Paper text:
We report here the crystal structures of [name]-Fc obtained from papain digestion of [name] from patient sera (sdFc), and recombinant [name]-Fc (rFc), both at substantially higher resolution (2.35 Å and 1.9 Å, respectively) than the previous Fc study. The sdFc structure was solved using the previously characterised Rea [name] myeloma protein. The Rea [name] oligosaccharide is a 70% G(0) glycoform that was later enzymatically galactosylated to yield a 100% G(2) glycoform. In both chains, a galactose residue attached to the α(1–6) branch forms hydrogen bonds with surrounding protein residues, but the α(1–3) branch galactose residue was disordered. A complex biantennary core was modelled in both structures, and with the exception of chain B of the sdFc structure, a fucose residue, attached to the first N-acetylglucosamine residue covalently bound to Asn297, was also built. In conformation 1, found in the A chains of both rFc and sdFc, as well as the low-resolution Fc structure, the Arg409 guanidinium group is oriented towards Asp399′ (of the other H chain), forming an electrostatic interaction. In the rFc structure, three conserved water molecules (W1–W3) are present at the CH3–CH3 interface, while in the sdFc structure, two conserved water molecules (W3–W4) are present, and the hydrogen bond network is comparable to that found in IgG1. On the other hand, in chain B of the sdFc structure, B-factors for residues at the CH3 domain surface, close to the CH3–CH3 interface, are considerably higher than those for the rest of the domain. The Ser400′ side chain points away from Asn390, its hydrogen bonding partner, and other interface residues, including Arg409, are partially disordered. Intriguingly, the high B-factors for residues at the CH3 domain surface, and partial disorder at the CH3 interface in chain B of the sdFc structure, may represent the transition of Arg409 between the two conformations, or may even provide an early snapshot of the dissociation process itself.
Author numbering: 237 to 444
Write the structure that this text describes.
């Protein structure tokens, strides 16, 4: 039969009040002849009705795909409430249910360190600025870079990695022209996480 997948919101969306965290329920392998797909949502057991459901969409393997999107309350997601998507077809009683929630467990605050380029990289045209982020729980987290009050784009961040003590760590690498680093520019690694004061902290880095 069909398959259902339930996806959490983005960490950044849950941590900033101004953004719109959403839980997404995706049904694949729907058949043309299947009666209209229906979605019931529950939040900690209670049915709710603000979900937006998109009309079904043909995939190339001759199946259909259906998505229902539930806007969630930041506080609720962070409080560890359980979102349940229940999926069925208009007429038949059979249904499929899926449940998701934030990771359970004592949250830990991330320590954020900045590392300048290795002296050995200094001979190249571009250098790597490193941001180590360690000791955090849960793994849901967001890392960004900026400079001169404007976002930097040329960075990549590793996935969270599980440490011995059950916390997570990761690295972020911002690549910049040597000429920009030694002119004395300040670069900032920004980290967003539920255990940080105001869900936010920032650590800066320039040539010493």
């Amino acid at each position: 039969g069909p398959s259902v997948f339930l996806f959490p919101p983005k960490p950044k969306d849950t941590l900033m009040i101004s953004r719109t965290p959403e839980v997404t329920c995706v049904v694949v392998d729907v058949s043309q002849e299947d009666p209209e797909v229906q979605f019931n949502w529950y939040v900690d057991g209670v049915e709710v009705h603000n979900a937006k459901t998109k009309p079904r969409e043909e995939q190339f393997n001759s199946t259909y795909r259906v998505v229902s999107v539930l806007t969630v309350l930041h506080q609720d997601w962070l409080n560890g409430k359980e979102y349940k998507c229940k999926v069925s077809n208009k007429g038949l009683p059979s249904s499929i249910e899926k449940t998701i929630s934030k990771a359970k467990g004592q949250p830990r605050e991330p320590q954020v360190y900045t590392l300048p380029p290795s002296q050995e990289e200094m001979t190249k045209n571009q250098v790597s600025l490193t941001c180590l982020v360690k000791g955090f729980y849960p793994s849901d987290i967001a890392v960004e870079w900026e400079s001169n009050g404007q976002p930097e784009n040329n960075y990549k961040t590793t996935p969270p990695v599980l440490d011995s003590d059950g916390s997570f760590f990761l690295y972020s690498r911002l690549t910049v022209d040597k000429s920009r680093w030694q002119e004395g520019n300040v670069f900032s690694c920004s980290v967003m996480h539920e255990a940080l004061h105001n869900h936010y902290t920032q650590k800066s880095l320039s040539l010493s």
